[PDB]
C-alpha cells in the first residue's frame, strides 16, 4: 500500500553526481592508462557487472586504486562514468567504437545494446 | 546531444538497496533509541538535508555512528530509510504523525509535503 515519489531516483542520482563533482566520500580511483577518475564504489557496482564483481571480492573490495586493462580508452571510460552518474550517454560517431568496447569490458549491457543498434543503422 | 536511458536512475537505486540489504560497503550506523540502522552516507546525504549537513562537516564526516534525537521514532526512521532506498513510502494512519515528524527532522521536504496533504484531507 506504499505511495511512490516519481522523481526520487533521479534526485538521488543528481546528488550522487554532485558528491562526485565535489570529490565528497569518493573511495576509489580508477586508473585508465595516464588518466585517473575518482568515484564511489557503490555507484560503480550498481552500474557495472565488472565493478560489481571486483568490489564483492573479499580482497579487491578494500583497494583504493583499480587499474583497468591497458586497451581501455580513457575518453570511453569518462563517457561511461558520466553515464553512470547521470543516465546520459554522450554517444558520437567519433567515440562509438571506444564506448562500445569499454561498455563490453565494464559489462554495461544496455549501453552495449544501443551502441550495437547505432552501428547497425550506419552500415 | 546525449541520449538518455529512462530506467537508469531507478536501476541504480535498486542496486543501492540490494547493497544495503547485503550490508555491502555500508559506512555508518544510525542509532535511533534502542534501534540501529546501517546505511551508506552518500545515499543519506542525497536524500536528507540533515545528513547532507552532518556528513559535509569536517569532523562528523568521519564518524561511523550517528545518534539521532531521542524524540525520533525508530519505525518512522525505518519507513524513511526504506523510502530513501526505494522511492516508496509506507504511509499509514497509524504511522503518519511519526513519519512527518521524522521527515521534518531529517529535512525531507517532499515527504513532509505529502504528509501535510494526507493529514489535511482527514480533518
Amino acid at each position: 500500500s506504499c505511495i511512490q515519489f516519481t522523481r526520487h531516483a533521479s534526485d538521488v542520482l543528481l546528488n550522487l553526481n554532485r558528491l562526485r563533482s565535489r570529490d565528497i566520500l569518493t573511495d576509489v580511483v580508477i586508473v585508465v592508462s595516464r588518466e585517473q577518475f575518482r568515484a564511489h564504489k557503490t555507484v560503480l557496482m550498481a552500474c557495472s557487472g565488472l565493478f560489481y564483481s571486483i568490489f564483492t571480492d573479499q580482497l579487491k573490495c578494500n583497494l583504493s586504486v583499480i587499474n583497468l586493462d591497458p586497451e581501455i580508452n580513457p575518453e570511453g571510460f569518462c563517457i561511461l562514468l558520466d553515464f553512470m552518474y547521470t543516465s546520459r550517454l554522450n554517444l558520437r560517431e567519433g567515440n562509438i567504437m571506444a564506448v562500445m568496447a569499454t561498455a563490453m569490458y565494464l559489462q554495461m549491457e544496455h549501453v552495449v545494446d544501443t551502441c550495437r543498434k547505432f552501428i547497425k543503422a550506419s552500415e | 546531444s546525449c541520449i538518455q536511458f529512462t530506467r537508469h536512475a531507478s536501476d541504480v537505486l535498486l542496486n543501492l538497496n540490494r547493497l544495503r540489504s547485503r550490508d555491502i560497503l555500508t559506512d555508518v550506523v544510525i542509532v535511533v533509541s534502542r534501534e540501529q540502522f546501517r546505511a551508506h552516507k552518500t545515499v543519506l546525504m542525497a536524500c536528507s538535508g540533515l545528513f547532507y549537513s552532518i556528513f559535509t562537516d569536517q569532523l562528523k564526516c568521519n564518524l561511523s555512528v550517528i545518534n539521532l534525537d531521542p524524540e525520533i521514532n525508530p519505525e518512522g526512521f525505518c519507513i524513511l530509510l526504506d523510502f530513501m532506498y526505494t522511492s516508496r513510502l509506507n504511509l499509514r494512519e497509524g504511522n503518519i504523525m511519526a513519519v512527518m515528524a521524522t521527515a521534518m527532522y531529517l529535512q525531507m521536504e517532499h515527504v513532509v509535503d505529502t504528509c501535510r496533504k494526507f493529514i489535511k484531507a482527514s480533518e
Partner: peptide
Amino acid sequence: WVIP
C-alpha cells in the same frame, strides 16, 4: 506522488 503516485500509486505505483
